[PDB]
Amino acid sequence: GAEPYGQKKFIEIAGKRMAYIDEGEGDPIVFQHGNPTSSYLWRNIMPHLEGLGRLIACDLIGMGDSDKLSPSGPDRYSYAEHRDYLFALWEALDLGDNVVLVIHDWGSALGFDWANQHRDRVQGIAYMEAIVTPLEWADWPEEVRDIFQGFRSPAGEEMVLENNIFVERVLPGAILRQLSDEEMAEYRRPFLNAGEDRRPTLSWPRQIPIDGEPADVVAIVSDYASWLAESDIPKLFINAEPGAIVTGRMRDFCRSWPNQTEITVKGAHFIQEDSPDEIGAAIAEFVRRLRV
Ligand SMILES: [Cl-]
Ligand code: NA
Ligand code: NA
Ligand code: NA
Ligand code: NA
């Protein structure tokens, strides 16, 4: 269960190498990770979709085996910069117009935004522990609120760049099981060096739309949230118990979305590490249904 899935391919986008999985034939099934993960997140999910489509899992810029930006610093790895690289990669990959999106965390902001911009090219959306509408601090799990407000303060650089707290604390804190040393090492790999190599993992929490900031991301999220609440695009909502960011009022909101089926699995935030086989089977049933 610790082994990566497949063998990564590489494409140069805007002078940087992006790494991604691309296996199989047919209409794509696109799996997008978030913070502080990579395509690896999906390694026990993707085998359940074998033979049902072209399976794609991209590593965001500066993450996984994609190259780092230079010079890195606080103005880099914003949502929009990530979107520039990922959307370019998706274009380069010639996805066509029957794309299924499988999305999590910042992967869900990116994927929901993509779908909102390309409504005619998305066959269906499976999402989990996603950014579904703009947040307030009350929506955030109490037990990590102090850490997240830390990230979103000048203390963030020390917390992440020097102390790697997102990788070392937040990630295993939001997985119910204990990862193996080997799993751990894979997740740490892109961020082993203190300093700017760890930047994406600090830029990301600074982009979360909370209390109206950052405004640009709030607007992007509001836009797709309003669209999804009325859209007839097929959806699969994978709810988690106890879950983390899709709880309370946020969970009520996404449950109101049209043309959607839902499952519940055990998990906190990184639920792929806790309930892969249920997740995989639900996505396989959804894709089979859409593609019959
Ligand atoms: Cl984050
Ligand atoms: Na991915
Ligand atoms: Na992807
Ligand atoms: Na990216
Ligand atoms: Na980032």
Residue numbers in the entry: 5 to 296
Quote the study on this structure.
Haloalkane dehalogenases (HLDs) (EC 3.8.1.5) are hydrolytic enzymes that cleave carbon-halogen bonds in a broad range of halogenated aliphatic compounds, resulting in a corresponding alcohol, a halide ion, and a proton. The tertiary structure of HLDs is comprised of two domains: an α/β-hydrolase core domain and a helical cap domain. HLDs are divided into three subfamilies, HLD-I, HLD-II, and HLD-III, according to the composition of their catalytic residues and the anatomy of the cap domain. Based on the sequences of modern haloalkane dehalogenases from the subfamily II, the most common ancestor of thoroughly characterized enzymes LinB from Sphingobium japonicum UT26 and DmbA from Mycobacterium bovis 5033/66 was in silico predicted, recombinantly produced and structurally characterized.
The ancestral enzyme AncLinB-DmbA was crystallized using the sitting-drop vapor-diffusion method, yielding rod-like crystals that diffracted X-rays to 1.5 Å resolution. The structural organization of AncLinB-DmbA is similar to other HLDs-II subfamily members; it is composed of two compact domains, a cap domain and a main domain. W110 and N39 act as halide-stabilizing residues in AncLinB-DmbA. The chloride anion is coordinated by two halide stabilizing residues with distances between the Nε1 atom in W110 and the Nδ1 atom in N39 of 3.29 and 3.37 Å, respectively. The 3D structure of AncLinB-DmbA was superposed with its closely related structures of descendant enzymes LinB and DmbA. As it is shown in Figure 2a the enzyme structure is highly conserved (RMSD of Cα atoms of AncLinB-DmbA and LinB is 0.778 Å and AncLinB-DmbA and DmbA is 0.895 Å), however, some small differences between the structure of ancestral and descendant enzymes were identified. The AncLinB-DmbA and LinB contain one main tunnel p1 (highlighted in blue) and one slot tunnel p2a, while DmbA has one main tunnel p1 and two slot tunnels p2a and p2b. The radius of the entrance in AncLinB-DmbA is the largest among the descendants: it is ∼2.5 Å, compared to DmbA ∼2.2 Å and LinB ∼1.4 Å.
